[PDB]
Paper text:
Fitting to the thermophilic nature of C. subterraneum, CsUb is an extremely thermostable monomeric protein (Tm > 95 °C in circular dichroism heat-denaturation studies). The CsUb gene encodes for a precursor of 87 amino acids (Ub-pre). We could solve the structure via molecular replacement using human ubiquitin as a search model, revealing for CsUb the classical β-grasp fold with a two-residue insertion in the first-loop region. Likewise, a cluster analysis of Ub-like proteins reveals eukaryote-like Ub sequences in E2- and E3-containing archaea, while other prokaryotes only encode for more distant homologs. Again, the closest connections to eukaryotic ubiquitin are made by sequences from Asgard archaea and Caldiarchaeum (dark violet, magenta; enlarged inset), CsUb being up close with 31% sequence identity.
The first complete archaeal Ub modifier system, including E2 and E3 enzymes, was discovered in 2011 in Candidatus Caldiarchaeum subterraneum. C. subterraneum Ub (CsUb), E1, E2, and E3 are organized in a single operon, adjacent to a second E3 protein and a JAMM protease (CsRpn11) with high sequence similarity to eukaryotic Rpn119. We have shown that CsRpn11 is highly active on its own, cleaving both CsUb precursors and, at a later stage of the ubiquitination cascade, CsUb-conjugated substrate proteins. Our bioinformatic, structural, and biochemical results reveal unique features of the archaeal proteins, but also remarkable conceptual similarities with their eukaryotic counterparts.
Author numbering: -1 to 78
């Protein structure tokens, strides 16, 4: 099935994202999709969930995500 998740920037006025995501998708997949939308190199970004640093291969099932939950997107400089 799918759950609705929100992605909000840690800083600034960038738009939040709302994605419908499969529960067997992983954190890394979410980050790939967010970075595709944001036009960002993946390694310039991290996602946190309730403040926690995340392993890319967590599924959203294993992490205990629920419909409506939010991840925070932390970004860095992009010229490296």
């Amino acid at each position: 099935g799918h759950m609705k998740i929100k992605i909000v920037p840690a800083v600034g006025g960038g738009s939040p994202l709302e994605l419908e995501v499969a529960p067997n998708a992983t954190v890394g997949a979410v980050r790939t999709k967010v970075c595709a939308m944001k036009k960002l190199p993946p390694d310039t970004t991290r996602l946190t969930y309730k403040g926690r640093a995340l392993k890319d291969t967590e599924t959203l099932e294993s992490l205990g995500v629920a419909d409506g939950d939010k991840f925070v997107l932390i970004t860095r400089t992009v010229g490296g």
